[PDB]
Ligand binder design. Structure first.
Ligand SMILES: [Ca+2]
Ligand SMILES: [Ca+2]
Ligand SMILES: [Ca+2]
Ligand SMILES: [Ca+2]
Ligand SMILES: [Ca+2]
Ligand SMILES: [Ca+2]
Ligand SMILES: [Ca+2]
Ligand SMILES: [Cl-]
Ligand SMILES: [Cl-]
Ligand SMILES: [Zn+2]
Ligand SMILES: [Zn+2]
Lengths: 4, 462
């Protein structure tokens, strides 16, 4: 999962 | 209960940024440090697995020199430059300082838990000058732990001179360690605002993982960016990996004259802004904010916020930490101690000093200073305060808080036994003035402040  | 303006300022500053306990700040629910930490670790993921708490980790990191692809689909890879490498290592260190993490660099074809690389274009191959950075949570999947930064941003290329770059590294590494943004929002998905914040403490003041500026919570960093983990981030990362109790266990000085060898805890001159949440695992420690001329408010209580160097809410003390001493600057400052034995120095300017519980030693410094007592428990005979530089006719000792049980009467050389009396007793041999306060309902005289110097009845505020 990506946090941008 | 009409107390003085000096006592009121202590009382109010003690309650600066109160949080949790059913409070509502900015029209939002208020989270405690811990509620905020649980929210930030809501993914319940660390390098040790899911819902695995308080377990250390030994991790590897790597500055990628090439890639086959970037997991996000962005393109135009560029490897880290020398400045980015240096600043990223300082960011890693600021995490390993507070939690039980070790970081070891790997090179060549070795795999790594955490990786660093830049991008410059989108999946369509067009230049991207708008985005900033992103990172992937721990896991076993392709790209887990990888962090990526936009090389077309000057702050990313120059993180040692552009503060947002260093903060971004710390931030991204946090995500790569398992921390999540306080609110369910992300760059690319619509347009979130501070109105979309779960709780009030969703701002740079409490967590660098927030999307919202410190101004949203009434803090003010004047355009600067904190480079290290903030109070809620420290609690969160410690929840995952355990606290690092080996860090700065000696007598540590934060601010001016610092011995921390950490840029974010160090001010080398009065133009330097400090933004930090201190972690310290032992020893007798000092907040030295002596180089500033701003009116400052310095609070030594665990979990509390201070207004330092003309900024607001820029310094805090992490949960689990005791800082013992504080030094104000030439401004008119407020210094609030904690239950430990504190040495407080107001410096020049007209300062308000409040030792709280414990046997404190107080130096007002030059200026018209006020030494405040809020309770009989602040200076018991068994653990009395010293006021070491009291100036008769100039300084004040504030005992107005005792009005709550009946305004103190000043007596000249004997107590009547009625209680609520205060006396100044001069020890001519030693040139010490003993301030004795006999509280109603106390069968013995249980409050004493010893003063190195003379004092007059008119210096005592009742
Ligand atoms: Ca220390
Ligand atoms: Ca300490
Ligand atoms: Ca001062
Ligand atoms: Ca104290
Ligand atoms: Ca002073
Ligand atoms: Ca003074
Ligand atoms: Ca005290
Ligand atoms: Cl206290
Ligand atoms: Cl003595
Ligand atoms: Zn993020
Ligand atoms: Zn700065």
């Amino acid at each position: 999962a990506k946090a941008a | 209960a009409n107390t003085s303006s000096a006592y009121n300022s202590v009382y109010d500053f003690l309650r600066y940024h109160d949080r949790g306990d059913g409070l509502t700040v900015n029209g939002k629910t208020s989270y405690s440090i811990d509620q905020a930490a649980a929210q930030i670790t809501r993914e319940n993921v660390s390098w040790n697995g899911t819902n695995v708490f308080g377990k250390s980790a030994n991790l590897t990191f790597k500055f990628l020199q090439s890639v086959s692809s970037i997991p996000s689909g962005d393109t135009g890879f560029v490897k880290f430059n020398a400045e980015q490498i240096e600043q990223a290592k300082l960011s890693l260190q600021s995490w390993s300082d507070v939690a039980n993490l070790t970081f070891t660099e790997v090179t060549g074809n070795k795999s790594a838990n955490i990786t660093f690389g830049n991008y410059t274009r989108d999946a369509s191959g067009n230049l991207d000058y708008g985005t900033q950075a992103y990172a992937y949570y721990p896991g076993n999947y392709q790209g887990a732990g990888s962090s990526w930064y936009n090389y077309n941003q000057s702050n990313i290329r120059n993180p040692g001179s552009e503060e947002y770059g260093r903060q971004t590294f710390t931030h991204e590494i946090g995500h790569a360690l398992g921390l999540a943004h306080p609110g369910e929002y992300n760059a690319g998905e619509g347009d979130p605002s501070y109105n979309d914040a779960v709780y009030a403490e969703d701002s740079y003041q409490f967590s660098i993982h927030s999307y919202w500026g410190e101004n949203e919570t009434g803090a003010d960093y004047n355009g600067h960016y904190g480079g290290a983990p903030m109070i809620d981030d420290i609690a969160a990362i410690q929840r995952l990996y355990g606290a690092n109790m080996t860090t700065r266990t000696g007598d540590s000085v934060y601010g001016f004259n610092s011995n921390t060898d950490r840029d974010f805890y160090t001010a080398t001159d009065s133009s330097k802004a400090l933004i930090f949440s201190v972690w310290d695992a032992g020893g007798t420690d000092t907040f030295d904010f002596s180089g500033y001329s701003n009116n400052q408010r310095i609070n030594l209580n665990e979990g509390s916020f201070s207004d330092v160097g003309g900024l607001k809410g820029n310094v805090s003390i992490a949960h689990g930490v005791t800082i013992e001493n504080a030094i104000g600057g030439s401004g008119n400052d407020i210094l609030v101690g904690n239950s430990a034995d504190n040495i407080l120095q107001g410096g020049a300017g007209n300062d308000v000093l409040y030792g709280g519980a414990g046997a404190d030693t107080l130096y007002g410094g030059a200026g018209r200073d006020t030494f405040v007592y809020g309770s009989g428990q602040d200076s018991t005979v068994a653990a009395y305060d010293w006021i070491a530089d009291f100036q008769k006719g100039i300084d004040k000792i504030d005992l107005s808080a005792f009005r709550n049980e009946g305004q103190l009467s000043f007596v000249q050389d004997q107590f009547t036994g009625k209680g609520q009396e205060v006396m100044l007793q001069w020890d001519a041999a030693n040139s010490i003035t003993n301030l004795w306060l006999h509280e109603a309902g106390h069968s013995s005289v249980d409050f004493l402040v010893r003063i190195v110097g003379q004092a007059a009845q008119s210096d005592i505020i009742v």
